[PDB]
mmCIF file with all atom_site columns, C-alpha atoms and ligand atoms in Angstrom:
data_model
loop_
_atom_site.group_PDB
_atom_site.id
_atom_site.type_symbol
_atom_site.label_atom_id
_atom_site.label_alt_id
_atom_site.label_comp_id
_atom_site.label_asym_id
_atom_site.label_entity_id
_atom_site.label_seq_id
_atom_site.pdbx_PDB_ins_code
_atom_site.Cartn_x
_atom_site.Cartn_y
_atom_site.Cartn_z
_atom_site.occupancy
_atom_site.B_iso_or_equiv
_atom_site.pdbx_formal_charge
_atom_site.auth_seq_id
_atom_site.auth_comp_id
_atom_site.auth_asym_id
_atom_site.auth_atom_id
_atom_site.pdbx_PDB_model_num
ATOM   1  C  CA  . UNK A 1 1  ? 105.300 93.581  93.322  1.00 28.53 ? 1   UNK A CA  1
ATOM   2  C  CA  . UNK A 1 2  ? 106.826 90.191  94.067  1.00 31.02 ? 2   UNK A CA  1
ATOM   3  C  CA  . UNK A 1 3  ? 104.914 88.381  96.760  1.00 25.50 ? 3   UNK A CA  1
ATOM   4  C  CA  . UNK A 1 4  ? 108.106 87.811  98.768  1.00 28.21 ? 4   UNK A CA  1
ATOM   5  C  CA  . UNK A 1 5  ? 108.696 91.548  98.864  1.00 27.08 ? 5   UNK A CA  1
ATOM   6  C  CA  . UNK A 1 6  ? 105.181 92.273  99.990  1.00 28.65 ? 6   UNK A CA  1
ATOM   7  C  CA  . UNK A 1 7  ? 105.690 89.673  102.722 1.00 29.78 ? 7   UNK A CA  1
ATOM   8  C  CA  . UNK A 1 8  ? 108.981 91.237  103.831 1.00 29.72 ? 8   UNK A CA  1
ATOM   9  C  CA  . UNK A 1 9  ? 107.370 94.652  103.943 1.00 28.12 ? 9   UNK A CA  1
ATOM   10 C  CA  . UNK A 1 10 ? 104.527 93.405  106.079 1.00 27.36 ? 10  UNK A CA  1
ATOM   11 C  CA  . UNK A 1 11 ? 106.966 91.663  108.470 1.00 26.29 ? 11  UNK A CA  1
ATOM   12 C  CA  . UNK A 1 12 ? 109.331 94.658  108.786 1.00 23.36 ? 12  UNK A CA  1
ATOM   13 C  CA  . UNK A 1 13 ? 109.894 95.886  112.350 1.00 24.71 ? 13  UNK A CA  1
ATOM   14 C  CA  . UNK A 1 14 ? 108.862 99.186  113.922 1.00 23.17 ? 14  UNK A CA  1
ATOM   15 C  CA  . UNK A 1 15 ? 112.517 100.121 114.150 1.00 24.29 ? 15  UNK A CA  1
ATOM   16 C  CA  . UNK A 1 16 ? 114.954 102.594 112.547 1.00 22.55 ? 16  UNK A CA  1
ATOM   17 C  CA  . UNK A 1 17 ? 116.710 101.297 109.484 1.00 22.60 ? 17  UNK A CA  1
ATOM   18 C  CA  . UNK A 1 18 ? 117.893 101.490 105.943 1.00 23.37 ? 18  UNK A CA  1
ATOM   19 C  CA  . UNK A 1 19 ? 116.207 99.644  103.124 1.00 24.32 ? 19  UNK A CA  1
ATOM   20 C  CA  . UNK A 1 20 ? 117.526 98.616  99.714  1.00 24.75 ? 20  UNK A CA  1
ATOM   21 C  CA  . UNK A 1 21 ? 115.379 97.543  96.803  1.00 23.78 ? 21  UNK A CA  1
ATOM   22 C  CA  . UNK A 1 22 ? 117.474 95.517  94.338  1.00 23.30 ? 22  UNK A CA  1
ATOM   23 C  CA  . UNK A 1 23 ? 117.212 93.924  90.907  1.00 23.59 ? 23  UNK A CA  1
ATOM   24 C  CA  . UNK A 1 24 ? 119.534 91.120  89.837  1.00 24.00 ? 24  UNK A CA  1
ATOM   25 C  CA  . UNK A 1 25 ? 121.817 91.925  92.754  1.00 24.31 ? 25  UNK A CA  1
ATOM   26 C  CA  . UNK A 1 26 ? 122.035 95.658  92.037  1.00 25.89 ? 26  UNK A CA  1
ATOM   27 C  CA  . UNK A 1 27 ? 120.506 98.277  94.369  1.00 28.08 ? 27  UNK A CA  1
ATOM   28 C  CA  . UNK A 1 28 ? 117.890 100.344 92.509  1.00 26.64 ? 28  UNK A CA  1
ATOM   29 C  CA  . UNK A 1 29 ? 116.659 102.411 95.477  1.00 27.87 ? 29  UNK A CA  1
ATOM   30 C  CA  . UNK A 1 30 ? 118.031 103.015 98.968  1.00 28.86 ? 30  UNK A CA  1
ATOM   31 C  CA  . UNK A 1 31 ? 116.114 104.807 101.696 1.00 24.11 ? 31  UNK A CA  1
ATOM   32 C  CA  . UNK A 1 32 ? 115.908 105.265 105.455 1.00 26.10 ? 32  UNK A CA  1
ATOM   33 C  CA  . UNK A 1 33 ? 113.144 104.982 107.971 1.00 24.77 ? 33  UNK A CA  1
ATOM   34 C  CA  . UNK A 1 34 ? 112.405 105.997 111.521 1.00 25.93 ? 34  UNK A CA  1
ATOM   35 C  CA  . UNK A 1 35 ? 110.174 102.916 111.490 1.00 22.95 ? 35  UNK A CA  1
ATOM   36 C  CA  . UNK A 1 36 ? 110.880 100.400 108.721 1.00 19.78 ? 36  UNK A CA  1
ATOM   37 C  CA  . UNK A 1 37 ? 107.319 99.080  109.010 1.00 19.01 ? 37  UNK A CA  1
ATOM   38 C  CA  . UNK A 1 38 ? 105.693 102.457 108.407 1.00 19.87 ? 38  UNK A CA  1
ATOM   39 C  CA  . UNK A 1 39 ? 107.966 103.568 105.595 1.00 20.15 ? 39  UNK A CA  1
ATOM   40 C  CA  . UNK A 1 40 ? 107.986 100.261 103.748 1.00 19.78 ? 40  UNK A CA  1
ATOM   41 C  CA  . UNK A 1 41 ? 104.222 99.889  103.935 1.00 19.27 ? 41  UNK A CA  1
ATOM   42 C  CA  . UNK A 1 42 ? 103.942 103.138 101.971 1.00 17.49 ? 42  UNK A CA  1
ATOM   43 C  CA  . UNK A 1 43 ? 105.258 101.203 98.948  1.00 17.22 ? 43  UNK A CA  1
ATOM   44 C  CA  . UNK A 1 44 ? 102.150 99.046  98.930  1.00 15.23 ? 44  UNK A CA  1
ATOM   45 C  CA  . UNK A 1 45 ? 99.948  102.017 97.971  1.00 17.77 ? 45  UNK A CA  1
ATOM   46 C  CA  . UNK A 1 46 ? 102.133 103.998 95.640  1.00 18.85 ? 46  UNK A CA  1
ATOM   47 C  CA  . UNK A 1 47 ? 101.692 107.741 95.932  1.00 17.58 ? 47  UNK A CA  1
ATOM   48 C  CA  . UNK A 1 48 ? 103.952 108.420 92.913  1.00 16.69 ? 48  UNK A CA  1
ATOM   49 C  CA  . UNK A 1 49 ? 104.990 106.723 89.662  1.00 19.50 ? 49  UNK A CA  1
ATOM   50 C  CA  . UNK A 1 50 ? 108.533 106.431 90.991  1.00 20.21 ? 50  UNK A CA  1
ATOM   51 C  CA  . UNK A 1 51 ? 107.303 104.496 94.044  1.00 21.07 ? 51  UNK A CA  1
ATOM   52 C  CA  . UNK A 1 52 ? 105.273 102.274 91.730  1.00 18.24 ? 52  UNK A CA  1
ATOM   53 C  CA  . UNK A 1 53 ? 108.371 101.579 89.574  1.00 18.17 ? 53  UNK A CA  1
ATOM   54 C  CA  . UNK A 1 54 ? 110.662 100.842 92.491  1.00 17.93 ? 54  UNK A CA  1
ATOM   55 C  CA  . UNK A 1 55 ? 108.230 98.236  93.850  1.00 20.88 ? 55  UNK A CA  1
ATOM   56 C  CA  . UNK A 1 56 ? 107.584 96.616  90.454  1.00 22.75 ? 56  UNK A CA  1
ATOM   57 C  CA  . UNK A 1 57 ? 111.160 96.461  89.231  1.00 23.65 ? 57  UNK A CA  1
ATOM   58 C  CA  . UNK A 1 58 ? 112.672 95.076  92.443  1.00 23.15 ? 58  UNK A CA  1
ATOM   59 C  CA  . UNK A 1 59 ? 113.270 91.338  92.755  1.00 24.69 ? 59  UNK A CA  1
ATOM   60 C  CA  . UNK A 1 60 ? 114.676 91.647  96.313  1.00 25.07 ? 60  UNK A CA  1
ATOM   61 C  CA  . UNK A 1 61 ? 114.309 93.919  99.310  1.00 28.01 ? 61  UNK A CA  1
ATOM   62 C  CA  . UNK A 1 62 ? 117.075 94.074  101.916 1.00 28.09 ? 62  UNK A CA  1
ATOM   63 C  CA  . UNK A 1 63 ? 116.542 95.739  105.269 1.00 28.65 ? 63  UNK A CA  1
ATOM   64 C  CA  . UNK A 1 64 ? 119.189 96.824  107.747 1.00 30.48 ? 64  UNK A CA  1
ATOM   65 C  CA  . UNK A 1 65 ? 118.053 97.553  111.299 1.00 31.36 ? 65  UNK A CA  1
ATOM   66 C  CA  . UNK A 1 66 ? 120.188 100.246 112.890 1.00 31.31 ? 66  UNK A CA  1
ATOM   67 C  CA  . UNK A 1 67 ? 120.843 101.516 116.378 1.00 31.28 ? 67  UNK A CA  1
ATOM   68 C  CA  . UNK A 1 68 ? 119.051 104.868 115.982 1.00 33.35 ? 68  UNK A CA  1
ATOM   69 C  CA  . UNK A 1 69 ? 118.055 107.610 113.578 1.00 35.34 ? 69  UNK A CA  1
ATOM   70 C  CA  . UNK A 1 70 ? 121.566 109.092 113.575 1.00 32.83 ? 70  UNK A CA  1
ATOM   71 C  CA  . UNK A 1 71 ? 122.978 105.823 112.262 1.00 32.48 ? 71  UNK A CA  1
ATOM   72 C  CA  . UNK A 1 72 ? 120.137 105.607 109.673 1.00 33.04 ? 72  UNK A CA  1
ATOM   73 C  CA  . UNK A 1 73 ? 121.084 109.056 108.403 1.00 34.77 ? 73  UNK A CA  1
ATOM   74 C  CA  . UNK A 1 74 ? 124.754 108.330 107.796 1.00 33.41 ? 74  UNK A CA  1
ATOM   75 C  CA  . UNK A 1 75 ? 124.334 104.687 106.666 1.00 33.33 ? 75  UNK A CA  1
ATOM   76 C  CA  . UNK A 1 76 ? 121.777 105.757 104.072 1.00 32.99 ? 76  UNK A CA  1
ATOM   77 C  CA  . UNK A 1 77 ? 124.022 108.603 102.785 1.00 34.26 ? 77  UNK A CA  1
ATOM   78 C  CA  . UNK A 1 78 ? 127.029 106.284 102.569 1.00 35.16 ? 78  UNK A CA  1
ATOM   79 C  CA  . UNK A 1 79 ? 125.196 103.514 100.734 1.00 39.91 ? 79  UNK A CA  1
ATOM   80 C  CA  . UNK A 1 80 ? 123.643 105.938 98.211  1.00 40.73 ? 80  UNK A CA  1
ATOM   81 C  CA  . UNK A 1 81 ? 127.108 107.355 97.564  1.00 42.69 ? 81  UNK A CA  1
ATOM   82 C  CA  . UNK A 1 82 ? 128.543 103.847 97.149  1.00 41.97 ? 82  UNK A CA  1
ATOM   83 C  CA  . UNK A 1 83 ? 125.862 102.377 94.896  1.00 40.34 ? 83  UNK A CA  1
ATOM   84 C  CA  . UNK A 1 84 ? 124.287 105.409 93.183  1.00 38.41 ? 84  UNK A CA  1
ATOM   85 C  CA  . UNK A 1 85 ? 121.046 103.530 92.705  1.00 40.35 ? 85  UNK A CA  1
ATOM   86 C  CA  . UNK A 1 86 ? 118.859 104.068 89.601  1.00 39.14 ? 86  UNK A CA  1
ATOM   87 C  CA  . UNK A 1 87 ? 115.970 105.702 91.449  1.00 39.61 ? 87  UNK A CA  1
ATOM   88 C  CA  . UNK A 1 88 ? 117.937 107.868 93.915  1.00 41.90 ? 88  UNK A CA  1
ATOM   89 C  CA  . UNK A 1 89 ? 118.370 111.417 92.707  1.00 37.93 ? 89  UNK A CA  1
HETATM 90 MG MG1 . MG  B 2 .  ? 116.361 108.933 101.337 1.00 41.58 ? 101 MG  B MG1 1
HETATM 91 MG MG1 . MG  B 2 .  ? 119.709 109.196 117.883 1.00 41.21 ? 102 MG  B MG1 1
#
């Protein structure tokens, strides 16, 4: 994983949000979190091959802090629909 992404993960707030791993400007995985910190840190110790791939392929990680879990739910759904990222089913 790129060092800048590891850094961003470790700095991420304990706040609801949506996260977007990207490669060459293209989202490759979009997810949501009740706490960005907790969810993003899970990528550092990959529990699945897919998690491993997402973290290795990415050259950028964008985070969007949201008002609450309700906003996380709909923002995530909308962005997945818009971008249909590689690693989202
Ligand atoms: Mg999701
Ligand atoms: Mg709420």
